């Protein structure tokens, strides 16, 4: 009933305001609270801050001095705003909803409660690097086969992560596999796609690969044929 | 923040503890992170879990103080693999901000899985573009730890090749891939290519020539 | 449209590194970047041309080195006739000599 | 006919029940085919066995109407994989003259076995005949599937070869060959010739060159 969304640039510059937001679909806004937690490589994951259902709002003293979070209840979107950002400011930010529960160990009358707050329901994560390296399109190369054969698509030299790849315009499905990224020491990531259909589908059911990199808008596709 | 691991045989139950123990009256959440993928929260209050997260995951309640906050996976299998968190409320101290540590859940006993070596020569394309690279994939085995090797014809080749660390598949096994990048001269002054994926005792080939 | 550096500065036996970057005109992976070392009205000099070949007589201390997306020319071991302005170029081999903003050094 | 598939682990009882069930009062012959041998008739009556069958092989009696006919093969071995079929007489229908369907029994959890393989040169007549043949000869492997690859030195040789099917031996492996043609000059003018046989996860390599 109720999903999120992220969605953000995919490169900023260091010292430079990053900016991120989430959509809500199916549920309001402005009757929940949100969070934002960003997980790095090797660090575990770090709870950035959350908001209210009447739009409060409450950082982590851990970047509590840089962190900016709000909220649009004309739609289902709330915005994240990170200035100062450095190396060490790349991961995978998440959006989810936090719901809040009452701990009552003694009289509520003396307070003595706590309240504690639980994300129920997650977004996707959206990948965010910071480098002062310029964006680049991938350049997609095809890969030609020869019980069954397989064939593929070669997507290499693009910065930075992510790609995704669908075949045929999201048609074919089942037997693709596609591969985790390869970073050269030129500074690049390099993916490779593959799917295995029957052999006497290659005359001529076409395959189409696509390619699509959000970070310089550069969508593409290419068939595969011996 | 640091981990620390846990080794569970398959079909077991796994017991992990929490990280801190709890000074007072507490409320507790468990969250299942594989890296890459989203967090799921399993148990929200301290034995309260939402739909859609099977019987097998439980939480210890706090009935007495003393108890201490245990997760609790019965049954484990291939697919609880993942860090494991463990968000701690009480009332003594204050706002639970840092998620804590994380246990790496490791379940033993997996069966062994053998590659599927598959290996593309140049494109026309690239090699019209004075480049050319060799792909070898790498996928279905477990456990995830390969080695690839390179030949020239009969003789070795390192100079140029990138390899990926083994990833998780969706099917609980692991895939990983290993690029030759090479001149287009290379390519054809040569025999052959070969690609040697050695995994666990064994080592297979594929191999790829300009014809 | 292709920017250098703002300015910079080192010590005698240290290194410098003067930087060149701009958008997919004029930069880079598809241009050749030279490197003119230029006293403020006087004859400029060549120093390195293809992106790190040094002219005839360049001390072996200048390098260059490109990256897909900015030029670097660092200048090792520093002596005193370093203090001059460098300007770097984006060029191919049928057209002009678009030139860098400017780097004091 | 038609054969429909059925896999029973290894020391369990089978279960195979007949293809067409009886209208009336029956009499059903079972039969064990391992195609290319003579059949042998296990049970003759509704449960009447001959001599030299044992008794793990049985057959349900016509009591009452109602109950299907099943034969019943109690603590499975490998030498039990084979085409079972269910001749089926009864007082409604007509003269039996089909033997049915098939039951294509494949026994699991067997012991996994690496191949012999045993690679020969060109003989001396065969080379003085103008012809050159390589042969390389693959037994005593579990699961009968392997992967046969030729080698004139380093590069790969697909051109003129000949591969066997697996086939099951008599100690319930399986063996097959693989046959390279080529002119006595190829013979003579490359260093060494391979055979690369990869069987499950590993590879094994026997070599040959003309000395």
């Known amino acids: 009933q109720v999903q999120l969304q992220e969605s953000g640039p995919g490169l900023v510059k260091p010292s430079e305001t990053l900016s991120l937001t989430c959509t809500v679909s199916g549920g309001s806004i402005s009757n929940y609270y949100w969070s934002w937690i960003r997980q790095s490589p090797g660090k575990g994951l770090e709870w950035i801050g959350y908001?209210?259902?009447?739009?409060?709002?409450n950082y982590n003293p851990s970047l509590k001095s840089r962190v900016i979070i709000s909220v649009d209840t004309s739609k289902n979107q709330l915005s994240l705003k990170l200035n100062s950002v450095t190396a060490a400011d790349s991961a995978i930010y998440y959006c989810?909803?936090?719901?809040?529960?009452?701990?009552?160990?003694?009289?509520?009358?003396?307070?003595?409660?706590?309240?504690?707050?639980?994300?129920?329901?997650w977004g996707k994560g959206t990948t965010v690097t910071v480098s002062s390296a310029s964006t680049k399109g991938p350049s997609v190369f095809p890969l030609a086969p020869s019980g069954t054969a397989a064939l593929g698509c070669l997507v290499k030299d693009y910065f930075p992560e992510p790609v995704t790849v669908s075949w045929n315009s999201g048609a074919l499905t089942s037997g693709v596999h596609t591969f985790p990224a390869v970073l050269q020491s030129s500074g690049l990531y390099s993916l490779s796609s593959v799917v295995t259909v029957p052999s006497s589908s290659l005359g001529t059911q076409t395959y189409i690969c696509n390619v699509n990199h959000k970070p310089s808008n550069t969508k593409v596709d290419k068939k595969v044929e011996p | 923040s640091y981990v620390r691991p846990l080794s569970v045989a398959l079909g077991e139950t796994a017991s992990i503890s929490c990280g801190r123990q709890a000074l007072g009256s507490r409320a507790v959440q468990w969250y299942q992170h594989r890296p890459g993928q989203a967090p799921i929260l399993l148990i929200y209050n301290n034995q309260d879990r939402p739909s859609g997260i099977p019987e097998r995951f439980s939480g210890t309640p706090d009935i007495n103080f003393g108890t201490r906050a245990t997760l609790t996976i019965s049954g484990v299998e291939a697919g609880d693999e993942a860090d494991y968190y463990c968000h701690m409320w009480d009332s003594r101290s204050g706002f639970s901000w840092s998620f804590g540590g994380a246990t790496r859940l490791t379940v033993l006993g997996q069966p062994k899985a053998a590659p599927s070596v598959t290996l593309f020569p140049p494109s026309s394309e690239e090699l019209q573009a004075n480049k050319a690279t060799l792909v070898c994939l790498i996928s279905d085995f477990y456990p995830g730890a390969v080695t690839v090797a390179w030949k020239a014809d009969s003789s070795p080749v390192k100079a140029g090749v990138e390899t990926t660390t083994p990833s998780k598949q969706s099917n609980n096994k692991y895939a990983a891939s290993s690029y030759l990048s090479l001149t287009p001269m290379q390519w054809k002054m040569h025999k052959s290519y070969s690609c040697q994926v050695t995994h666990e005792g064994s080592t297979v080939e594929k191999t790829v020539a300009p014809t | 449209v292709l920017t250098q550096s703002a300015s910079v500065s080192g010590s005698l036996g240290q290194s410098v590194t003067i930087s060149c970057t701009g958008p997919n005109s004029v930069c880079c992976s598809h241009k050749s970047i030279s490197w003119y070392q230029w006293p403020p009205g006087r004859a400029p000099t060549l120093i390195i041309y293809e992106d790190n070949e040094r002219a005839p007589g360049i001390s072996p201390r200048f390098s260059g080195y490109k990256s897909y997306w900015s030029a670097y020319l660092t200048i090792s071991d520093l002596r005193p006739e370093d203090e001059t302005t460098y300007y770097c170029c984006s060029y191919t081999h049928n057209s002009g000599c678009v030139f860098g903003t400017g780097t004091k050094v | 006919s038609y054969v429909r598939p059925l896999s029973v682990a290894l020391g369990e009882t089978a279960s195979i029940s007949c293809g067409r069930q009886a209208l009336g009062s029956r009499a059903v012959q079972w039969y064990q085919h391992r195609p290319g041998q003579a059949p042998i008739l296990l049970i003759y009556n509704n449960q009447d066995r001959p001599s030299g069958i044992p008794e793990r092989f049985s057959g349900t009696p016509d009591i009452n109407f109602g109950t299907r006919a099943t034969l019943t093969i109690s603590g499975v071995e490998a030498g039990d994989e084979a085409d079972y079929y269910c001749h089926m007489w009864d007082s409604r229908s007509g003269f039996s003259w089909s033997f049915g369907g098939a039951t294509r029994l494949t026994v699991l959890g067997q012991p996994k076995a690496a191949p012999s393989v045993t690679l020969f040169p060109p003989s001396s007549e065969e080379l003085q005949a103008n012809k050159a043949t390589l042969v390389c000869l693959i037994s005593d492997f579990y699961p009968g599937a392997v992967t046969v690859a030729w080698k004139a030195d380093s590069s790969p040789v697909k051109a003129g070869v000949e591969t066997t099917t697996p086939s099951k031996q008599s100690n319930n492996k399986y063996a097959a060959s693989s046959y390279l043609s080529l002119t006595p000059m190829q013979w003579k003018m490359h260093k060494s010739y391979s055979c690369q046989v990869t069987h499950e996860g590993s590879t094994v390599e026997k070599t040959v060159a003309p000395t």
């Open positions: 989810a909803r936090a719901q809040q529960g009452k701990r009552i160990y003694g009289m509520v009358s003396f307070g003595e409660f706590f309240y504690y707050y639980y994300m129920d329901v």
């Open positions: 908001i209210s259902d009447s739009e409060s709002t």
